[PDB]
Amino acid sequence: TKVKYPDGFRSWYHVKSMVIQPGHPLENPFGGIHHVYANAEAIQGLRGGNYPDGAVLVFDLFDYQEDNHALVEGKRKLIGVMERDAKRFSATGGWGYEGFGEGKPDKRLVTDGGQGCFGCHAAQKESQYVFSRLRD
Amino acid sequence: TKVKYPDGFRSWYHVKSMVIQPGHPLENPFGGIHHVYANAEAIQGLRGGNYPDGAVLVFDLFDYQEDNHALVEGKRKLIGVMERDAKRFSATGGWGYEGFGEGKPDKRLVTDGGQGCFGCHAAQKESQYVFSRLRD
Ligand code: HEC
Ligand code: HEC
Ligand SMILES: [Zn+2]
Ligand SMILES: [Zn+2]
């Protein structure tokens, strides 16, 4: 019933990126520069298919340093992970939600079976609980 | 003698990202959110191996918009492209330099054989004229 650590996600397709600066509603704990990655199965859902079991999306969050009006990536803060399994994760709309502190497999962040994550993602039910959209 | 448009570069490994904001010395013309991509041959050279002819690095530059203490990706401004051919691009350190406006294959930007690009990259001779470093 645990989300698997998504080994090798850095080699996956880069969906998009966004900077969340101090003052943003999501600052705690998602402040920083994040990159969204999708495995092959998740790309099927992002393209307008149904997300297959085994789809994984990763929210890869870095600290940044503002230096002379450049925002420069610092250390990895955490990753967020969504793992599709319609049966195993039925209580949170078919996605398992986990966080890994500093992107380390032994630093699991979710302590409520992913209900809090799901509570916010639920608004995106019509896009299968996923915020990020494919871009060129 | 022309640098090839790097078709399918959006499927390549994402090396790193950076934001260049107003008041930074590179704001014209590199202001925005940029993502660096590397093909297989470029990964060999980055990882600390040497760069094979055929290595390609892409600088993918987006305008961004301010949205309530987030910086959100906007339209693509341009791509920069370095293609390795030690013999063909010998006049610019063995990399061919090209810009494509809005990332469109039909909007080539470089008019001086890439000597302007190379002038800045020459400072990075000890890393084979590449600024970007691999990160986790
Ligand atoms: C200094 C005034 C520069 C000039 C002129 C050009 N580039 Fe460059 N480039 C510069 C920097 C500081 C960086 C690193 C950005 C980062 O995120 O660390 C880059 C990077 C590239 C890359 C990616 C590979 C690398 O060397 O890191 C490419 C593909 C690239 N630049 C291409 C490019 C082209 C085609 C230029 C002339 C049109 C050009 N650059 C000029 C700094 C400078
Ligand atoms: C209060 C709102 C909110 C909460 C709580 C939340 N997120 Fe999300 N999450 C977002 C938003 C907004 C995005 C889209 C970011 C973007 O567009 O770059 C996002 C994106 C993601 C993504 C990339 C896929 C997508 O849907 O775009 C993953 C993976 C993710 N979140 C995981 C988590 C996990 C794991 C938790 C709990 C540990 C969680 N999130 C909590 C708002 C939330
Ligand atoms: Zn405010
Ligand atoms: Zn600033």
Author numbering:
A (entry chain B), B (entry chain A): 3 to 138
From the paper:
In M. capsulatus (Bath), two related β-sheet proteins (31% sequence identity) have been previously identified, a cytochrome P460 (McP460) and a cytochrome c′ (McCP-β)5,6 encoded by the CytL and CytS genes respectively. Cytochromes P460, defined by an unusual porphyrin-Lys cross link at the 13′ meso carbon, catalyse the oxidation of hydroxylamine (NH2OH) to form N2O under anaerobic conditions. In contrast, cyts cp-β (the only known cytochromes c′ with a β-sheet fold) lack this crosslink and appears to be optimized for binding non-polar molecules (including NO and CO) without enzymatic conversion. High resolution crystal structures reveal a highly similar tertiary structure between the two proteins but major structural differences around the heme pocket consistent with a switch of function between hydroxylamine oxidation (P460) and NO binding/sequestration (cyt cp-β).
The crystal structure of McCP-β was solved by SAD using the anomalous signal of the intrinsic heme Fe, and the structure determined to 1.61 Å resolution. McCP-β displays a highly β-sheet fold that is quite unlike any known cytochrome c′ structures (all previous examples being 4 α-helix bundles), yet very similar to McP460. McCP-β exhibits a novel distal pocket structure relative to NeP460, McP460 and all cyt cp-α structures. The pocket is comprised of hydrophobic residues, with two aromatic Phe residues (Phe 32 and Phe 61) centrally located above the Fe in a ‘capping’ position well-suited to sterically influencing the binding of diatomic ligands (we name this structural feature the ‘Phe Cap’). In contrast to the structures of cyt P460, no heme-protein crosslink is observed in the McCP-β structure and the equivalent residue, Phe 61, now forms part of the Phe cap. In contrast to McP460, there is no porphyrin-Lys cross-link or potential H-bonding residue to interact with heme-bound water or diatomic ligands in McCP-β, and indeed the heme is 5-coordinate in the resting state with a vacant distal heme binding site. The proximal pocket contains the conserved haem ligand His 123 and an aromatic Phe 133 residue (oriented perpendicular to the imidazole plane), analogous to all reported cyt P460 structures this arrangement differs from that of cyts cp-α in which a conserved positive, polar residue (Arg or Lys) lies adjacent to the His ligand. The McCP-β structure also shows that the His ligand forms a H-bond to the carbonyl of Tyr 99, analogous to the situation in McP460. The heme pocket of McCP-β is much less solvent-exposed than in McP460 with a highly hydrophobic distal pocket with no water molecules observed within the McCP-β heme pocket. In the low frequency region, the ν(Fe–His) vibration of Fe(ii) McCP-β is evident at 219 cm–1, which is ∼10–15 cm–1 lower than for Fe(ii) cyt cp-α proteins, suggesting that McCP-β has a weaker proximal bond.
